[PDB]
Amino acid sequence: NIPHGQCVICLYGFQEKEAFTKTPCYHYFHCHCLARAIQHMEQELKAQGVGVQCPVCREPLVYDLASLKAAPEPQQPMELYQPSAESLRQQEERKRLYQRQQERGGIIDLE
Amino acid sequence: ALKRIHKELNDLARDPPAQCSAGPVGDDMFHWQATIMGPNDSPYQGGVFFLTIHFPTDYPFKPPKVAFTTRIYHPNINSNGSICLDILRSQWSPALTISKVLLSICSLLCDPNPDDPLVPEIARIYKTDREKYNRIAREWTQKYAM
Ligand SMILES: O=C([O-])C(=O)[O-]
Ligand SMILES: [Zn+2]
Ligand SMILES: [Zn+2]
Incomplete structure (x- = not known):
């Protein structure tokens, strides 16, 4: 029915009524996500001189860009960032290490 | 870029690569600091090395800019901390x-x-002289990163 895995471009999974596609190399992407990837590849190729390829496995890709662009963009809630108590403790320790390196002339300062 | 950046941040908090950490500099989600503990199979063992990460507007379709902040003696990293590495230029993909x-x-x-x-x-x-090379790399690690 609906794919159980993750889209590697946006890092979200697939939900009911979302628009997604499956490549000939067996990889699933939201339609919107693959469209964006292809646009960038087309730009880079032109600036050097097809070579549009799957982001996962590098297999040359067949596609229709307009069809992919027409699909609805998934509405996906942003994942909040709430550092755990342990993470906050770890960040404080890093601050101390950085300070010592500065004193040693061990930090590159490009100014 | 921002939703993708938040996803990565949460994954790196749950399950970061061995010996590494990464998270935002202050309030700015597009500028991160990372750390690498010197790998046990290298003359950098025992040191902690800081790096800077800047995400471009079109991330993840263009590569992050990554440089060393901690001084390091290495044929592929210069005195400005610039890194010669294929995946940071010609070999980047949005799957990375x-x-x-x-x-x-x-x-x-x-x-x-x-x-x-x-x-x-x-x-x-x-x-020409790997003994001399590893010696000097260890010496710089001890002076600057430990
Ligand atoms: O770079 C230096 O000056 C050193 O490691 O002694
Ligand atoms: Zn996606
Ligand atoms: Zn593929």
Whole structure:
């Protein structure tokens, strides 16, 4: 029915009524996500001189860009960032290490 | 870019690559600091190395800019902290992640690529006198990163 895995471009999974596609190399992407990837590849190729390829496995890709662009963009809630108590403790320790390196002339300062 | 950046941040908090950390500098989600503990298979063992990460507007479709902040003696990293590494330029893909980039740099520290150097004298020494090379790399680690 609906794919159980993750889209590697946006890092979200697939939900009911979302628009997604499956490549000939067996990889699933939201339609919107693959469209964006292809646009960038087309730009880079032109600036050097097809070579549009799957982001996962590098297999040359067949596609229709307009069809992919027409699909609805998934509405996906942003994942909040709430550092755990342990993470906050770890960040404080890093601050101390950085300070010592500065004193040693061990930090590159490009100014 | 921002939703993708939040996803990565949460994954790197749950399950970061061995010996590494990464998170935002202050309030700015597009500028991160990372750390690498010197790999046990390298002359950087025991040191902690800070790096800077800047995400471009079109991330993840263009690569992050990654440089060393901690001084390091290596044929592929210069005195400005610039890193010569394929996946940071010609070989980037939107399937890659910061977690994967950190894993790649760890590998480069263990095994340099002397034939594509940023520092010709260090490359000459690496190729002609590895004993001298590892000695100097350890000496810089001890002075600056420990
Ligand atoms: O770079 C230096 O000056 C050193 O490691 O002694
Ligand atoms: Zn997606
Ligand atoms: Zn593929």
